Scaffold this active site. Structure first.
Site, PDB file in Angstrom:
ATOM      1  N   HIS A 142       0.883  -1.203   0.000  1.00 27.26           N
ATOM      2  CA  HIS A 142       0.000   0.000   0.000  1.00 27.26           C
ATOM      3  C   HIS A 142       0.904   1.232   0.000  1.00 27.26           C
ATOM      4  CE1 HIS A 142      -3.492   2.489   1.460  1.00 27.26           C
ATOM      5  NE2 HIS A 142      -2.430   3.199   1.846  1.00 27.26           N
ATOM      6  N   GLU A 143       1.860   1.218   0.940  1.00 30.46           N
ATOM      7  CA  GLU A 143       2.806   2.308   1.121  1.00 30.46           C
ATOM      8  C   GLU A 143       3.746   2.605  -0.053  1.00 30.46           C
ATOM      9  OE1 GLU A 143       1.639   4.340   3.296  1.00 30.46           O
ATOM     10  OE2 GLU A 143       1.016   2.914   4.919  1.00 30.46           O
ATOM     11  N   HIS A 146       2.090   4.335  -2.823  1.00 26.78           N
ATOM     12  CA  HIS A 146       1.974   5.806  -2.769  1.00 26.78           C
ATOM     13  C   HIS A 146       3.191   6.447  -3.470  1.00 26.78           C
ATOM     14  CE1 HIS A 146      -1.432   6.569  -0.294  1.00 26.78           C
ATOM     15  NE2 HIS A 146      -0.921   5.849   0.714  1.00 26.78           N
ATOM     16  N   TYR A 157      -3.341  14.826  -1.949  1.00 25.96           N
ATOM     17  CA  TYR A 157      -3.867  14.076  -0.842  1.00 25.96           C
ATOM     18  C   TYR A 157      -5.045  14.706  -0.119  1.00 25.96           C
ATOM     19  CZ  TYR A 157      -3.328   9.934   2.332  1.00 25.96           C
ATOM     20  OH  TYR A 157      -3.432   8.794   3.073  1.00 25.96           O
ATOM     21  N   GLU A 166      -5.716   6.891  -2.111  1.00 24.38           N
ATOM     22  CA  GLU A 166      -5.841   5.768  -1.123  1.00 24.38           C
ATOM     23  C   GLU A 166      -6.304   4.413  -1.714  1.00 24.38           C
ATOM     24  OE1 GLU A 166      -3.844   6.760   1.596  1.00 24.38           O
ATOM     25  OE2 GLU A 166      -5.143   5.055   2.038  1.00 24.38           O
ATOM     26  N   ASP A 226      -9.962  13.618   8.155  1.00 24.98           N
ATOM     27  CA  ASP A 226      -9.179  12.706   7.338  1.00 24.98           C
ATOM     28  C   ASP A 226      -8.981  13.256   5.969  1.00 24.98           C
ATOM     29  OD1 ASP A 226      -7.989  10.299   6.572  1.00 24.98           O
ATOM     30  OD2 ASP A 226      -9.909   9.495   5.883  1.00 24.98           O
ATOM     31  N   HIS A 231      -9.454   8.260   3.458  1.00 34.69           N
ATOM     32  CA  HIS A 231      -9.501   6.854   3.865  1.00 34.69           C
ATOM     33  C   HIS A 231     -10.966   6.354   4.011  1.00 34.69           C
ATOM     34  CE1 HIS A 231      -5.520   7.952   5.365  1.00 34.69           C
ATOM     35  NE2 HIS A 231      -5.165   6.740   4.976  1.00 34.69           N
TER      36      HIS A 231
HETATM   37 ZN   LIG Z   1      -2.356   5.293   2.168  1.00 36.43          ZN
END
Ligand SMILES: [Zn+2]
Ligand SMILES: [Ca+2]
Ligand SMILES: [Ca+2]
Ligand SMILES: [Ca+2]
Ligand SMILES: [Ca+2]
Length: 316
Positions: A142-143, A146, A157, A166, A226, A231
């Site tokens: 996931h990271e 990005h 973002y 996301e 958020d 998210h």
């Molecule tokens: Zn993320």
């Protein structure tokens, strides 16, 4: 570090034994010279100062409990590199074999992981909400994804473009989990979340509502927390992506599934060729339709499935 490439062995957060690529120069370092310009894993030593010290070990055996998170961050970043290379022909996150850096043992009882614009950072968890975050291959991918987004579409973002950012990361982390065949599923973070409770996860792609996230555009979060729900609203896209792959009837709209491989191909193309920093959900719809058109033809089943999927979630 300049030295001799070798291979060490260790145990990961889940207690699994694995081989890792190391570099020997007096000590054995967590430096893998076999992938692009290298994969480097650092010890942040419970501090917030980054990256910390390149990981050094005396004997090339990583079985101590403090070693666990570093073994998994280093091995899982290798698998992710491999997925991108083998599947999409992309060399590292920037497409030019940029070195991949990760720091583990960041802060004290830190319950998150992130891409900071230049490296990956992993908390060890507080031991109850989470165990060390690098133990989840979907979290690692996931990271790293990005980084990919950052170098391609550059999705800001916040708001719609951030929810897209996301969703992309959840989609690709799930594809990497299937790729490694590591007990795959359509849930996010299951392996590292609430070590005491079984069966749960952080987010669900198959049923975002299970955890309160929207599965339809009409249920979209319009507030401010958020970063405008980056998210939260990713659930609308995650559901669209699960239906394209797997199929199903959602809110009375039927989707024939086209499978995971095609889903990865259409999303990667949308990401790298059509999305921009400020793309919204409706623009992702057009970008996905155009990619599937490019790849399979306007009259394909693939294109038909992408339209049904977005109609099922109320996007357009
Ligand atoms: Zn993320
Ligand atoms: Ca050792
Ligand atoms: Ca799993
Ligand atoms: Ca998962
Ligand atoms: Ca759990």
């Amino acid at each position: 570090i300049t030295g001799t490439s070798t291979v060490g062995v260790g145990r990961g957060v889940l207690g699994d034994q694995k081989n890792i690529n190391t570099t020997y120069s007096t000590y054995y370092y967590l430096q893998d010279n076999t992938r692009g310009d290298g994969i480097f894993t650092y010890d942040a030593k419970y501090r917030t100062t980054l990256p910390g010290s390149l990981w050094a070990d005396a004997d090339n055996q990583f079985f101590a409990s403090y070693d666990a998170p570093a073994v998994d961050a280093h091995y899982y970043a290798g698998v992710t590199y491999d997925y991108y290379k083998n599947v999409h022909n992309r060399l590292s996150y920037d497409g030019n074999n940029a070195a991949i850096r990760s720091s583990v043992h960041y802060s004290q009882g830190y319950n998150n992981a992130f891409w900071n614009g230049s490296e990956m950072v992993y908390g060890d968890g507080d031991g109850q909400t989470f165990i060390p975050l690098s133990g989840g291959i979907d979290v690692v991918a996931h990271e790293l994804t990005h980084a990919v987004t950052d170098y391609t579409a550059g999705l800001i973002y916040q708001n719609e473009s951030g929810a897209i950012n996301e969703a992309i990361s959840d989609i690709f982390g799930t594809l990497v989990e299937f790729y490694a065949n590591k007990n795959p599923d359509w849930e996010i973070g299951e392996d590292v979340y609430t070590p005491g409770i079984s069966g749960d996860s952080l987010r669900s792609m198959s049923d975002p509502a299970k955890y309160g996230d929207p599965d339809h555009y009409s249920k979209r979060y319009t507030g401010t927390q958020d970063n405008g729900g980056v998210h939260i609203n990713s659930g609308i896209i995650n559901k669209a992506a699960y239906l394209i792959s797997q199929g199903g009837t959602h809110y009375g709209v039927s989707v024939v599934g086209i499978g995971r491989d095609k889903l990865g191909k259409i999303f990667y193309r949308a990401l790298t060729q059509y999305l921009t920093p400020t793309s919204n959900f409706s623009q992702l719809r057009a970008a996905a339709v155009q990619s599937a058109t490019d790849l399979y033809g306007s009259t394909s089943q693939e294109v038909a499935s992408v339209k049904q999927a977005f109609d099922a979630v109320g996007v357009k």
